[PDB]
Structure formats: C-alpha cells, structure tokens
Amino acid sequence: LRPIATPYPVKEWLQPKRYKAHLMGTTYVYDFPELFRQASSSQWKNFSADVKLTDDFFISNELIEDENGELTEVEREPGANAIGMVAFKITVKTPEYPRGRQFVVVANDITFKIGSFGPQEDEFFNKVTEYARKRGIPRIYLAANSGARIGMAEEIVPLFQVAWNDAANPDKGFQYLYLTSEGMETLKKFDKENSVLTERTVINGEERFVIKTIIGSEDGLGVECLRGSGLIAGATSRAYHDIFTITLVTCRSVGIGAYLVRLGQRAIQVEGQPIILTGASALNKVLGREVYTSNLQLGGTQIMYNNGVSHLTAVDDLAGVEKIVEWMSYVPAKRNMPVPILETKDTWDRPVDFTPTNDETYDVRWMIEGRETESGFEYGLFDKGSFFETLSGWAKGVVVGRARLGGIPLGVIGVETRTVENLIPADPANPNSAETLIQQAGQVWFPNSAFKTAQAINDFNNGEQLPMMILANWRGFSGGQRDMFNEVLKYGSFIVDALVDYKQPIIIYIPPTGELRGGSWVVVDPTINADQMEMYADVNARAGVLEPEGTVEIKFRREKLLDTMNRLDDKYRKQLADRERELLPIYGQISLQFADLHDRSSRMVAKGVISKELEWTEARRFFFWRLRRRLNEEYLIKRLSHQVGEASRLEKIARIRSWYPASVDHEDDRQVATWIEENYKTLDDKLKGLKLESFA
Amino acid sequence: LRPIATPYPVKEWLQPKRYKAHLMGTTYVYDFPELFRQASSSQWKNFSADVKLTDDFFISNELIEDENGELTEVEREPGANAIGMVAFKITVKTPEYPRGRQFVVVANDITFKIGSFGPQEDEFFNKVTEYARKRGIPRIYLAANSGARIGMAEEIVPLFQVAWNDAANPDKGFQYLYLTSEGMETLKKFDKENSVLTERTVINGEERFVIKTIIGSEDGLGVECLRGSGLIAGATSRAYHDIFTITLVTCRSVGIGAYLVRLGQRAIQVEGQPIILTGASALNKVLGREVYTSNLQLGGTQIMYNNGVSHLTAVDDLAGVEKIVEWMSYVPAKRNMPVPILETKDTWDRPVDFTPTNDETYDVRWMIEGRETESGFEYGLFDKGSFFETLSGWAKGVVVGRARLGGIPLGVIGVETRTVENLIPADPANPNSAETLIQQAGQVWFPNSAFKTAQAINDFNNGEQLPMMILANWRGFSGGQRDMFNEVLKYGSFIVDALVDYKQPIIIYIPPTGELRGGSWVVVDPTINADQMEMYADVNARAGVLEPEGTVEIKFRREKLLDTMNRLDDKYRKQLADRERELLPIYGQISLQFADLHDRSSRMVAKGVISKELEWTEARRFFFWRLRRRLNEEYLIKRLSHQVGEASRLEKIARIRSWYPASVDHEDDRQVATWIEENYKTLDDKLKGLKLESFA
Numbered sequence A, B: 001l002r003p004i005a006t007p008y009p010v011k012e013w014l015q016p017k018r019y020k021a022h023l024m025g026t027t028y029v030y031d032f033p034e035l036f037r038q039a040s041s042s043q044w045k046n047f048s049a050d051v052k053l054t055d056d057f058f059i060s061n062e063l064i065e066d067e068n069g070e071l072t073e074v075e076r077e078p079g080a081n082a083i084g085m086v087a088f089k090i091t092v093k094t095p096e097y098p099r100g101r102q103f104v105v106v107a108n109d110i111t112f113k114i115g116s117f118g119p120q121e122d123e124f125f126n127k128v129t130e131y132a133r134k135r136g137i138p139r140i141y142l143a144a145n146s147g148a149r150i151g152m153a154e155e156i157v158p159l160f161q162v163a164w165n166d167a168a169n170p171d172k173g174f175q176y177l178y179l180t181s182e183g184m185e186t187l188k189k190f191d192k193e194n195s196v197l198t199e200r201t202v203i204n205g206e207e208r209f210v211i212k213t214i215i216g217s218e219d220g221l222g223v224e225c226l227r228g229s230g231l232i233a234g235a236t237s238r239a240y241h242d243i244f245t246i247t248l249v250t251c252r253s254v255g256i257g258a259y260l261v262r263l264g265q266r267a268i269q270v271e272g273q274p275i276i277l278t279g280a281s282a283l284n285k286v287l288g289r290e291v292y293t294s295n296l297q298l299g300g301t302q303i304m305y306n307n308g309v310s311h312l313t314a315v316d317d318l319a320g321v322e323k324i325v326e327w328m329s330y331v332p333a334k335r336n337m338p339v340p341i342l343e344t345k346d347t348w349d350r351p352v353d354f355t356p357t358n359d360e361t362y363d364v365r366w367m368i369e370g371r372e373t374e375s376g377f378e379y380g381l382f383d384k385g386s387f388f389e390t391l392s393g394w395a396k397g398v399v400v401g402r403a404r405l406g407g408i409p410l411g412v413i414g415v416e417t418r419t420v421e422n423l424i425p426a427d428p429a430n431p432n433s434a435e436t437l438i439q440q441a442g443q444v445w446f447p448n449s450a451f452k453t454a455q456a457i458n459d460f461n462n463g464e465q466l467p468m469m470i471l472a473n474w475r476g477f478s479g480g481q482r483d484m485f486n487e488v489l490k491y492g493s494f495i496v497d498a499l500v501d502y503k504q505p506i507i508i509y510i511p512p513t514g515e516l517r518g519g520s521w522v523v524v525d526p527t528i529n530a531d532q533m534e535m536y537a538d539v540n541a542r543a544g545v546l547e548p549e550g551t552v553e554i555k556f557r558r559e560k561l562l563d564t565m566n567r568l569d570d571k572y573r574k575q576l577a578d579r580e581r582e583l584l585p586i587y588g589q590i591s592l593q594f595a596d597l598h599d600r601s602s603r604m605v606a607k608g609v610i611s612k613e614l615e616w617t618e619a620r621r622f623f624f625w626r627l628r629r630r631l632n633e634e635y636l637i638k639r640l641s642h643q644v645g646e647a648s649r650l651e652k653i654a655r656i657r658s659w660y661p662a663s664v665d666h667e668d669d670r671q672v673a674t675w676i677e678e679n680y681k682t683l684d685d686k687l688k689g690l691k692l693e694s695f696a
Ligand SMILES: Cc1ccc2cc(CC3CCN(C(=O)c4cc(-c5ccccc5)nc5ccccc45)CC3)ccc2n1
Pocket: A441, A444, A475, A476, A477, A478, A479, A480, A517, A518, A545, A546, A547, A548, A549, A550, A551, A553, B278, B281, B282, B283, B285, B286
C-alpha cells in the first residue's frame, strides 16, 4: 500500500490495473462509464442550471458473453475481464431524451496484454457491434491498443535442435531445425503433438524429426489474429452505414486499431495519443537509417487532425467523452427515430442580425451562429450556442458542423471567404524535401475542400440521419494544373454521389453577397436528388455559367461595344480611335453591368431553377417552418411506404396532400406543419384503414 | 465543291458539318456508328480469322424524341439534328454474343453550337441514360463539347439606355441601365414583354423604365443550363451503379463535360483532347499573370492518364472505339445476365509455366498472361492474349485489368514488385515550385495504389458485374510521415468498403514468393465479405502479423538467444562475451528461421484462415473449376432468392446442396459444376414447384 493514510481507499492499490493504465497515460477502462456520467451531468448543467439530477438519470451495465456466447448484462468488480475487450450498455436521460437514450461503449483494455487484439477480443468486438446494429443504437469505441496480438510457439523454444553444416563450427551455417525422439515425447506427454508438422529422417544412426511448420498450441499467434482484424474492419465498415459510430483515441491505436478509427469515420483524438500503422523504430530498421524520431511524428494530432482522419482533438479523456456526448445530442436515440428537437432560449421567431457586406471581410461562422460585438450579440441564422464544428483542422476553406434551427438539429456546410493557408511538412525520408506552404483562394473548391464537403454530406446522412443546409458560395473548382493533377474531378464527383444517397431534407441556399457559378452549381443542383433537395437564392446573391468578366469576353466583344458607342455616344456617332480610347473603360463597365443584370435571383425564379428568392434577415423564420413542414411530410411519406407494395414519391406526396382540408394552402409551411401535428393520430387512423390492401 | 473530280461523292461537301468536325480534329458524330462497325468487324477477325461477316451482324439506329418526348428509332440523313446531342441504339453480333448484344451511344455534336449543353441537350442525354438503365444495357458517351451553353438577352442589347451621372462626360460614370417607352413598345410588339423586369420612374419630364433584371426570351442563357448540367451529373452518378458506363473523350470535354467523364468512371482519352474545367486563358485573366500556356497543360493525357481519371489513352478516335469494344467483351450483354464466357485456343487444362523466383526480378504481368521467351511462350495463370490492363498510367505499384480463366471473364489485381517512380509536375502558379520524383517501394501500399485498388474493386463490381481475383502480395501500408499525412488510412479503408459491396465471387490468392502481413492482410481478409470471398495461399507464400525480423525483435530477444546458446552450444554451456560475439550472427539466423516456420501456408490451413494451400503450376486447373462451380451455385442462390420472402445465404446454399445426389462430393468443384449444368432444367422444375409458397 502506497500511499498510506489517505482519507478514502487507494483505488490504484485495490485494482493495480488502474495504476498500470494511468502509467500508460490513459483512463482505466472501468473508470470510463464514470467519465460518461460526469459529461452527461455537465450536459444538463449547461442546458438548465437548476435541474436536480439523481443517480438514476445514468445507468452503465457491463456486457459480457454467457456460456452460449450471447451478450448479457453483469455487475461485477472491475478487472475481472478474462479478455482484453470490454463493453458497457449505457442508459442516460439527456436534455434531448429526458426519458432516456441508449448506446454501447466498446473499449480495449490497455492493461490486458497491452490492448492487443487476439481472436477472442475480435469476436467480442464484432458481437458488440452486431448487438448495437440489431438495436439501432450508437456504438462508441474507446481505442487504447497495440494492434493484432503477436506470438510464437513457446513450447518449441526449449525443444528444437539445429542441423549444423559443421557441428564444431556453428558460424559455418545450418541446414534445418529438428526435434529428437525425447522432444517429440515431451510434446506427446503434454498433448501438444499438433504444435509442429515434422518429417522423420535418419542421419548417422539418429532419428531426426525435421520441423516443416511450427503451429503452436496457444491460439492468437499470427494469421488467426489477422482474420479477426479483417472481421472487425468489415463489421465497422457496415456499422457506419447503419448506426451512429464514433471513436475516442485514448492511448495509442495501432494497425487494426488505426483502421477501426477511420472505418467508424467520426474520430476524436486525445493530444499526444498516436494513430499509427508500423511504428517509427520498425520503419527505421526497414529504411536502414534513423529517419523518424517518434510515433507522434507519424500519427499525432498534427498529422490526423490536419488530415481530417481526426474530426476533433481533445486535451484529455474527459474532454473527449464530453465531445462524444455533445456530438450525440444532435443524433436520434436509435436508427430511424426522428431527429431530436431541442428548443433553447433562442426561439425561431426573430430576424437574423449578422448580415455580410461586399466591402467587408467576414467569418462565415458569424452568419451561422452569430457574433459578439461591443454593442451586443448579433444573432446568426442558427440557434445561439448551437454550432458544433467538426473536421476543423482540415481543409479550412469549407466550414462543417452541426447546428440547431429553432431546436431542429441539422448538418451545416458553409464557405470560408478568407484565403486559407496549410503547411505540408517536410518528408523526413527525403533529405531534398522542405516544408511547403499552400495558399488556397476563398470561394474556390480544391481537392481537399471538395473531399471534406463530400465527407460531411456522408457523415450527416449515415448514422446521424440529419437534414442538411449548404450555404452555397463557390465561384467554381480550381481548374489549374496542380489541382487538376491532384484529382479535383474525383473529389467534386464524390459530392454528387453523396447527394444522390442523401435520405433527409436538403436546403441549398446562396446567401447575401454569395455566388454560385459553372462547376460549383452543377455539383449542388436540386435535380441531383429531387426527392430531398430544394434550392433558394438570396435577393443579394448571384449566379450564372461564368462571372460577368467571362460573359463579356464571350458575348459582349469589341464589335458589340463599338455598336453600343455608335448608338449611345453622340460624339462617336482616326478621330474614332482617340474617342474609343476615352469611352472603352466606361463601356466595359456598362457591358459588365448588363451581364450582371442576368445573374439575379429574379432570373433564377423566372427560369424555375430555385424554389424561392429570400431576404437573409427573414431566412431563419422561413427555413424553420419549411424544415418543420418537410420533416412532417417525410414522416407521412415513410408511413405510406409501409403499406402499398409499389408507388412513386410524387404519388405518395399527392395522396398525403389530398388528405389536407381544402382550405389548407399546400404552399403555407406553417399551416401544413400545424395541421399535421394536430392530426397525427387521425392520420394514423387513416393509414391503418389503408391496410385493406391486397397487392400481388 | 472542293475537291473536284473525285471517284466518289465528297461527303464533306454533301454534309459541310462533317468538314467542320474534321477542322476541329474530331470524327463527325454521324460517322461514329461506322467506327463501331469497323471495330466490331476487327473483333471477329482477331477471334476467328475465317468468319464470314455480312452487314446484318451490325445495326445502328438513331434515337430521337417523338412528339410526346418518347425515344423512337429513325432512319434520316446525317446533320438533320435540331439539338446538339445525338444517340444511336447499336445491335451487334460479337464473338461473346454471336446472336447479338445491344448498347446505346450518346454523343455531343461539336458542330452544333460548339457542342455546348443547353437544356434540350441535357434533357435528351438524361432520357437516353434512363432508356439504357431501364433496359440494363451499356451507355457509351462520346464527349466533344464546350460545357454549359452561355448567352445574353440579345434583344435588350440595341434597346438599353444609360443614366449617365453627367451626359456630357460619360467617363464620370452611370447610375443604372433603363428602357424608354419606345424600347418597352418594341418588346410589347415582338411579344418579349417578360425579357426584362423594370421599375418605372420619371426623371426631368421623361419616363424611364429602370432595368432591375434581364431575363431574355431565348432559353439556354445561364442558370437553366446549370440545372440541366446537375440533372445529367446525378443521372450519370446513378447509371454507374446500374449499367456499364464508359466515355470516349474525342475532342475537348469542358465543365459539365469533364464531370461526366469522371461520373461514368471508365474513360478513354484520345491524345491531344483535353478534359478541363476553367480554361488556361480564363485562369490567366483571374490570376492577373500568364501562368498557363495551354488547355492541354491543364487536362491533357499527361494529367488525366497519370491521375487515373483516364483509364486508357487512344492514339485516335477508332483506337478509342476499339478499346471500348474490347472492354465490353468482358461485360454481360445487360444487367444481371451471366458474365460472357469466351473460350479460346488456350484451354483450362494445362499447368502454369511462368513461375516467380525469390532470387530474380519479375514483372507480375508474366504471372498473369505469360511471357515470350527464346525457348517459346511461357503460359501464365490466365488465358493467352486475354489480359486487358486499365488505369495503366496511374499508381503503377498495383496492376489492374480484365482477363479470362478458361474463358471465364474476371477482374484481376496484381502487385508490381519493382520500385515505381512517378513525376509530380512543377506548379506553374508557384515560381518557387520544381518537379518532384517520387519513388515507391514494391509490395507496399501507398495512398495512390490503395485508391487504385479500391477503384478497381468498385469498377469490376458496378456495371461490369465481374468475379475477381486479387494476387495479394503486400508487406503492408506505408506508415511513414508523408504517406500518413497524405491519408493512407482513408484509401486503405475504401478497399474494405469496396469488398463489403462486392456481389460476385472473389478469390484472394497469396502467390509463390508472395507475402501478406499486418495491415495488408486485414483489408483483404475473406471475413469482410464471407458470402463472396475465399482466401488461398501458395505452398511457397508467407504470412504473419510481422515479418520474421519484427517477430524476433518482440518475441526472440537477447535473453532467449542466450538461453538457446546455453542449450545448443557446448562451449557456451568475460569468456562468454567473446563467445557471444562469435555465436550471435548465426543464432540471429536460427531465430529468424524459427519465426519463418510459423509463417507457412500449413499454419494458415491448420488455423482455418485459408480455404486451401495450393501449388502455382496447378492453380489454373484448380481456379477454373472453383470459379465455374461458384458461378453455378451463385445462379441457384439467386433463383432461390426470388421465391422465399426471408432466408439467409447459409440456408439457401444448404438447401441447394441438399438437391445434389448423395454420391456427389460437395467439395469436388468439377463434379458439382458438371451435375448443375446437366440439370439446369430439372433444377428449374424444382424451383418452379417451390412456388407453393404463401409467406406473410
Ligand atoms: C486559384 C483560383 C482562384 C480563383 C478561381 C476562380 C474561378 C472561378 C472562375 C469563374 C469563371 N471565370 C470567369 O467568368 C472569368 C472571370 C474573370 C475575372 C473575374 C474577376 C476578376 C478578374 C477576372 N475573368 C475572366 C476572363 C475570361 C473568361 C472568364 C473570366 C473564370 C474563373 C475558378 C478557379 C479559380 N482558381
């Protein structure tokens, strides 16, 4: 016992494994449910300071496998785990789910054979993944490991012999490894006969059993651990499309551990905890030179957060757990359940205060969440304090996060208008390599920002099942040599693919001072997914194939400018050339203005390419009721789908809308939402009566 | 008429549009079906030189929209197209489909408004895509365009007036653009009232109609072309997952044209024909410096073929058409039809001649397709002349292509064992940028080669619907700083995702002299997709978590080596240190051999991680019958699926196998395939009788 005379019992002495996990710079596995309780208690405190929580608000039950390999809940003392993988089923009352929400927490035990993954740990992690998937509940993975377990047949070590080329001179070489009759007998005795595959031979009177293959009696030495690693890699790939998946990197995550981080997609990395494949010293041995200094050089946050492999960083394990809990607050309690509404002080019924200006630099986050000023807070489009930014270390030209609109959770994608700089590190393996600073113009999609946008769309859709708003403001894609060589077309195409797959309502909105041109419009047009997408443009937004400079270059050339001077200038209508020299700068401005007059939201409305033209200050009120109406109609379309056999979206929506009273304006979002909400049970009666269907 | 006195009529005079397409360095649209006839005739000549083809072997029928917008077949004179998009339905008798196969060819007409995409061209291209998708037939796109159509309201050009700040001094500026009563009347007269949105004002006695927005009477000016571009981008994204999609870049492909190339995935680029977004001169104007010299610098084959955006290059349009036809020869006639068997001179019943050696450098293509030697041809694993390599300009560390195994078409992925070099061009926009040469070690996955592998798996699965063989031979992934920063984990994870989605049989085979370690095994393990995947290892292959050097470093350390010297060396069992110095180099070799003895295919079999251990020379015979048996069982599993409502793969296969006579060995591939093929109609009788099912 160290230390002596403490007021309460020494937990690191009661369970020495707790001390071992601490020495490795991580939380002991069995202490993680307490971090989740602390983080959930903080959630309530930030939401409503006066709430009185009792311990029954949070329940953690360890999951273990019974005799039949089926998962069962247990209450046992920490550290009794016979495998290096542990899991907990958590039931917690949260501000968004005050009656309770559930999720599973899977975690490596860093104290159990260094958190290595053997076949038993792989099979348990897979069983836990399937358990969560069957229930539709989130799967949280706490990564603290050493990758696949590695071993040798330790029983053959004191038994094997060597067929020396020259017995007197060992340095001269050897032919093979073998066992003697007594070696074979030792194996026969301990029932380890199948530990080796041998070929009996006789050399100078003595029978030698030539070792052809070493198998070993102990399970979890090599290939069997690689099979289990593949199983859990595929399981995680599947889980990402099915349930909400997230990983906290709490101590190192090696090999399969690094792949699990990425396969679950959503990842929070604790600072100083590396995500690696082969380590620095192993790499150095292969390279035959001291190239790398540390594992943190290979997989620290300055690699992974800058990459977008880590969506967020955390200063410590509790900060990481808090970020999991905060991320989950935007996510349904289980698969296919409605998105969790959480109304706060900042109600839908207000104008948007922060307005961008053409003559002034702004941070898009101000438009999203608002900004603090000396004269008071300027409210943004979304709820005050609701913006949760993710992938904040990578491709900063695009701003992605979760926010709330009058309480409705949604994914938000905005455009950073300021020039973004990123530092490409010098390659330690190349002596002729130096660090590169890359500058990327604002409102231009680059390979990295296009990849981040596609990734965001997929992460809001899969597991999170959230509606989305893109505040579309791009001039185009980078068509330059470097970015074209770096496959900008591939990443831009991933955006189209991500939108095709989207299952919840989408709002595309060109904001005030905003623009959408050529290739940038293409990749975000609502006809990519007409079932879910709608486009809107601000009265102060612009859009066309080219910018006015481009349009004039192709369609308002010198001949047309001169005919315009001929019509409009009395002096014009060698003495022409000097007049042309004087008129050209202003006539170039007239032509640019003429072109800009086509790029208005009024032309977008007339041509039917946008649903409506909007005023920014009224966009919060408009979008709140539009989104609320859309969620309600989507619920009814899904109910009608359950009883038909075969009908299109257009036919399903036309039928639902035919149930609305004649006096209801189908174009009034607030009226449609209000009527549906007042009639959910009446609509249920109607849907249940439609089960008079016999379709073959 | 130019030239005069030709033996036959001047086609470039009869149809001047033919001459215009030629002046633009491309085939005239209406001459493309003839290139397909020429290429299909060549297919027959290469297959069986003595075949007698008549003109009824190939039929091309132009598709146009009728009064109701429905596609109908027409026989009309070339050049009568009222839109800049044309399509043909092709019916061709090929060596793989001697009774005929069909596909659609969609193409821009470069002579029609520079191949620009207006709303009508977009709607026709979408209608053609849907037509092919509904029928399950391939969609071939011939890209020769200028992107989205750009325009202005040309009727407002001679009408608009300017509100000068000072009428006498135009240079001093202007307030707005306006129309007069006579301007408004001109618009009223020609029924173009809605061409502008105006605001009537009176300034110094005269009524001025202030132009607030220019709309225009002509359709296809701006945003409406961007909507149509989005529609066809989404349509192509969908088509790729549904039917076989391919694009030939035959003249430039701009904007939406560049996106269509990528969205259809499979692309052949004719040399000197660029795939661009914004062009060089437009980019130069934005950058305010002469940065780029040409469009070919931005999107030539040296960009796109090196990127993997272009799967192949072609010296000319006919070479391109021939490569389409050759690619299609491995693909089913329509969606869900069986893969086309094409038996040639090189029959299944032979050993594999080319065998790799540990002490000698080899090209993996020799193992795949064989090699010419002075002593004769050394046959490879696959049919002689059947290897069709694709993505050959990009990530050369991985070799991808289509091949045939005793006539069975399949996707093949092999590993290039030689060091691969690639040249990263100097960024023209950065004066402080120079070209970089990157060397990549063989048998190591890098971000580019991992992306190429995932891309290949997806392209064999989607549309092609082919079985696959991966000749798995990777030591691991590059875990170094540069490759980790360059997101190797993301690309490696895409491999897992691509395997999860795979719908046809997969063979993973570790070849002779081959190896599969740590992270490389993980990403290719058959438990990722147990319904489709099987793994095999050569008797001369190796596999474990680490390489023997790594295993000894962790599990056979100095203490263990010294205890081994204590047991095996009579002299060992300060006078120890000098003995240690002498023994250590050979005892290090013993420990490496001890570790290598665990890495054998015999341990893989014993641990149940591979289906069988094989001998390379017998692999062609083994895999032919294994694949043939698997295709037959897959056909029956799909038939059983059509009549059940709910049953797992394991239950479906167990039922099918219960139909085999008792004397049939379920493990004998050749016997199982033979029995199924002799009993297809009898099995059909049994399946039709199982339609006594009433499941609710
Ligand atoms: C690194 C970088 C930085 C900015 C980028 C902007 C775009 C947008 C397109 C719009 C379409 N387009 C034009 O429409 C255009 C814009 C301008 C232009 C605009 C603003 C200032 C100066 C010039 N001049 C032109 C000249 C000829 C043809 C087209 C134009 C070109 C430019 C694309 C890639 C970019 N890459």
